[PDB]
């Protein structure tokens, strides 16, 4: 199992590039490639990738051709180029998982005993990362239903080598805004977090709408998880949590006040120095 | 539009549409682009567009072009030099000449080129008494031409500057508006 | 602000200039020349700068 996975800007760029290549060549709506990386302790760093010729139908959910001969040729060649980048999984640029994903994961597992799929949604997004990482795992159902292979999510994030960071920063030299300030950036992070929480709640609400109306069968694991969450929701009017909140709010506002006073004194010192310099310069000019 | 060349086309289109009008909206757009836009070529084009828009009132250009010339971007400085040249062409503006004089001998080949060319455009058909810098700039041009220190583009600027100064047998001036006050479309297009 | 930024950008350029040696003057000649022992080896006669 892999709890954490780090994808790289080179991987993202190559995935976008492969999607564009296939779009220009024909019309598939999805592209699949192989993903090479390292195995830092319980952390999968996927450093590179290469496209492989993949095709599938839209109806049977079983008619799909993946060229593992091309896969192994390209992998051995990339091994000749660089050795540390071993097969670590595969990627497919679908907006969402597919039925074939389990079979393709088995085909990859024929190569990597612990293969991690990463859906790299090439379509631009706003409230989430572009990579969704999954790992196949057997689901031993408690209700006696037969055990079946299923995809399990693993926390995925984007990280860069030193050179990758240098390159991406050069590319974003004029777009990325760095004159924001730490406080402004953190407030932006807070509002983005609120937006993400709202998006997750809206997804759950839509699923509940579908289930209640009847499109989706009752999923007992999901219902268990939902009621566990709703029970985990805290109470902020207990008359003891309120006292603790006020006590810590004051314990923080005292420090904020001290810092503000110190900043005010420093600003007054700067003003005194500036006015002293101004008078000295003016008097010397008048001399 | 995405293309930097299309953005430069937009700057030049603003220049041509509002030439001479001195429209504050066009000035705002051009100057904001010259400031904040991510391509140096289009920044320079925007400054030149501002120069085009401000030629009916050559007294106003010196301020903005000075702020943009004692400035950051080499392309912005060069655009300011050409804006001054286009604005004051045929006027012999002392303020514009004073602004361009520091720009000559700038640490950039094309900036020096533009400053020299604009200076010659301004002193087109001028003499010592009208503006007491013509001899200074002529000797500067001659030294730049018969020097090896200066870069090839500075040499190009100096040759063009001498040509402008002595243009038309020294019997011609460059005026974007006719002597009767009508914008001279051939002159605008030529510049 | 613009002067500050320009100073930085010219700083990157003018920090690649060769560093200047340090030498102890032992005796000043005529015609604007000075005998200097340059650390740690070498005794030259160097023309003084016109400043």
């Amino acid at each position: 199992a892999v709890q954490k996975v780090v994808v790289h800007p080179l991987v993202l760029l190559s995935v976008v590039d492969h999607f564009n290549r296939i779009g220009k060549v024909g019309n598939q709506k999805r592209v699949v490639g192989v993903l090479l990386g390292s195995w830092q302790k319980k952390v999968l760093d996927v450093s590179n990738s290469f496209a492989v010729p993949f095709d599938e139908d839209d109806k049977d959910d079983s008619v799909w051709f993946l060229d593992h001969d091309y896969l192994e040729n390209m992998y051995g060649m990339f091994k000749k180029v660089n050795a540390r980048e071993r097969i670590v999984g595969w990627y497919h640029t679908g907006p969402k998982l597919h039925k074939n994903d389990i079979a393709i994961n088995e085909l990859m597992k024929r190569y990597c005993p612990n293969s991690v799929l990463v859906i790299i949604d090439v379509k631009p997004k706003d409230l989430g990362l572009p990579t969704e990482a999954y790992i196949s795992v057997e689901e031993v159902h408690d209700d006696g239903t037969p055990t079946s292979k299923t995809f399990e999510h693993v926390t995925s994030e984007i990280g860069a080598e030193e050179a990758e960071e240098v390159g991406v920063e050069h590319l974003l030299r004029d777009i990325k805004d760095t004159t924001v300030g730490t406080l402004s950036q953190r407030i932006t992070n807070q509002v983005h977090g609120l937006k993400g929480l709202n998006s997750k709640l809206l997804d759950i609400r839509s699923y509940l709408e579908k289930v209640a109306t009847g499109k989706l069968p009752i999923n007992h694991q999901i219902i268990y998880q939902l009621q566990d969450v709703f029970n985990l929701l805290p109470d902020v009017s207990l008359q003891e949590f309120v006292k603790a909140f006020y006590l810590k709010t004051n314990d923080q506002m005292v420090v904020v006040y001290l810092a503000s006073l110190i900043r005010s004194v420093v600003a007054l010192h700067n003003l005194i120095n500036n006015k002293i310099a101004n008078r000295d310069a003016e008097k010397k000019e008048g001399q | 539009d995405k293309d930097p060349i299309l953005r430069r086309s937009g700057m030049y289109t603003v220049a041509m549409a509002y030439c001479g009008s001195g429209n504050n909206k066009a000035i705002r757009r051009l100057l904001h682009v010259a400031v904040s836009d991510v391509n140096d070529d289009v920044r320079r084009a925007a400054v030149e567009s501002l120069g085009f828009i401000l030629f009916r009132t050559p007294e106003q250009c010196p301020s903005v072009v000075s702020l943009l010339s004692e400035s950051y971007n080499p392309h912005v400085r060069y655009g300011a030099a050409m804006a001054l040249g286009i604005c004051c062409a045929g006027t012999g503006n002392k303020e514009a000449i004073n602004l361009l004089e520091p720009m000559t001998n700038d640490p950039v080949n094309y900036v020096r080129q533009g400053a020299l060319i604009a200076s010659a455009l301004i002193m087109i058909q001028q003499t010592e008494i009208t503006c007491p810098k013509v001899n200074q700039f002529r000797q500067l041009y001659s030294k730049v031409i018969n020097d090896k220190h200066d870069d090839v583009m500075a040499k190009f600027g100096a040759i063009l500057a001498q040509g402008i100064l002595d243009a038309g047998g020294h019997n011609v001036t460059i005026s974007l508006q006719s002597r009767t006050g009508h914008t001279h479309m051939p002159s605008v297009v030529g510049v | 602000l613009n002067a500050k930024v320009r100073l930085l950008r010219e700083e990157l350029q003018l920090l690649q200039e060769q560093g200047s040696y340090v030498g102890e003057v032992v005796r000043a000649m005529d015609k604007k020349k000075v005998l200097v022992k340059v650390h740690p080896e070498g005794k030259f006669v160097v023309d003084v700068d016109k400043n």
Partner: peptide, 30 residues
């Protein structure tokens, strides 16, 4: 009030109004 004091001081600070031979020398020495 402290933040107001800092802002007022920063606003109040008055900034008073304010070589090519080296350029050539560098180019020649290089």
């Amino acid at each position: 009030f402290c933040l107001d004091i800092h802002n007022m001081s920063v606003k109040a600070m008055r900034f008073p109004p304010k070589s090519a031979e080296e350029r050539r020398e560098r180019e020649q020495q290089d």
